[PDB]
Design a protein around this ligand. Structure first.
Ligand code: I0J
Length: 329
């Protein structure tokens, strides 16, 4: 559509990378979409780390539209340590170019080994301002404040298959991408993209679950107890001292992850939550399920769910829309 469709690149069918440019010189940098992360993050030429030098780095001097807030920003996530200073400049994504406030990082040691190995140089913030630092408005909302898109909405088309090419339609919805019905579900809150659905894995039940879709997450989460009670003699090998699990690729005991709600029902099947780990041992597949508990009932619909279901997000509707992703081609 005349809307901005940012192609998503396929990587080991485990993550998608989206190209983008920042600065007046439109310096190119690889950024992965993140339904959660907000304030955009940018690698900086001022970064003295070894992992920074092997990837693209932004330059503040080669931008006539650059601005220096100077306010320091230290992001030290768990097993991590990051630091950058506020910097506003022209952020060019596809056919749209809006001045946005980004965090110019100079320290990336706490994730330096993980970044050096990874082909991304930054991240993408596509969440509600509630999760944004320095009270920074959402990119897609600011594109609708400007005469650049007519709707504050963004859709995802993960390039699961090698031939399948990813796309991020921003400003409208293309029926071509999603085949069959498109159902919307209310948001339990407006801080970040999240909904309330009733999880049912066969006889195992957990209603009123805060299903949250994350493009960054590369697996489907689940409460710790739910992961165990459901996996009782299902021939699912477990990895000790390692948060991973293996299992037969053809086993009939492998359930389907289904979420029921008043507006419609969703179902993720084995071919979606299984990984072809036959590389180490033929015929062996890994469950892309990472169990984790939170302060209130919560589930995570990461790449797996988004890969099968074309996702839709609308700040104006205060809802997440879901529909079957069109078969490759
Ligand atoms: N995805 C995701 N990313 C996260 C990222 C962080 C740290 C990011 C700091 C910037 C790192 C960086 C950027 C650019 C270049 C080098 C380094 C912390 C928590 C989450 C975190 O919780 N999540 C999960 C969901 C839920 C809410 C957010 O997204």
């Amino acid at each position: 559509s005349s809307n901005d469709n940012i192609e998503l690149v396929d990587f080991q069918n485990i993550m998608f990378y989206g190209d983008a440019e920042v600065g007046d010189n439109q310096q190119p940098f690889t950024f992965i979409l993140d339904t959660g992360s907000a304030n955009l993050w940018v690698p900086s030429v001022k970064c003295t780390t070894a992992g920074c030098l092997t990837k693209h780095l932004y330059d503040s001097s080669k931008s006539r539209t650059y601005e220096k807030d100077g306010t320091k920003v230290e992001m030290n996530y768990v097993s991590g340590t990051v630091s950058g200073f506020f910097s506003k400049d022209l952020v060019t994504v596809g056919n749209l170019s809006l001045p946005y406030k980004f965090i110019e990082v100079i320290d990336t040691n706490g994730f330096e080994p993980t970044y050096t190995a990874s082909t991304f140089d930054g991240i993408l913030g596509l969440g509600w301002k509630d999760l944004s630092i320095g009270s920074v408005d959402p990119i897609v909302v600011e594109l609708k404040n400007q005469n650049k898109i007519e709707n504050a909405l963004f859709t995802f088309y993960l390039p699961v298959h090698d031939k399948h090419t990813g796309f991020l339609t921003i400003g409208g919805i293309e029926e071509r991408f999603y085949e069959g019905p498109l159902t919307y579900e209310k948001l339990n809150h407006d801080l970040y993209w999240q909904i309330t659905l009733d999880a049912h894995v066969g006889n195992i039940s957990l209603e009123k679950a805060n299903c949250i879709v994350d493009s960054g997450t590369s697996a489907i989460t689940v409460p710790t107890d739910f992961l165990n009670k459901m996996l009782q003699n299902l021939d699912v090998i477990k990895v000790p001292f390692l948060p991973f699990y293996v299992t037969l690729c053809n086993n009939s005991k492998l359930p389907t992850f289904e979420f029921t709600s008043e507006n419609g029902k969703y179902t993720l099947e084995p071919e979606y939550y299984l990984q072809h780990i036959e590389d180490v041992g033929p015929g062996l597949c890994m469950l892309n399920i990472i169990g984790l508990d939170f302060p209130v009932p919560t589930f995570i619909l990461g790449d797996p769910f988004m890969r099968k279901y074309f996702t839709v997000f609308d700040y104006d509707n205060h809802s997440v829309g879901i529909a079957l992703a069109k078969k490759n081609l």
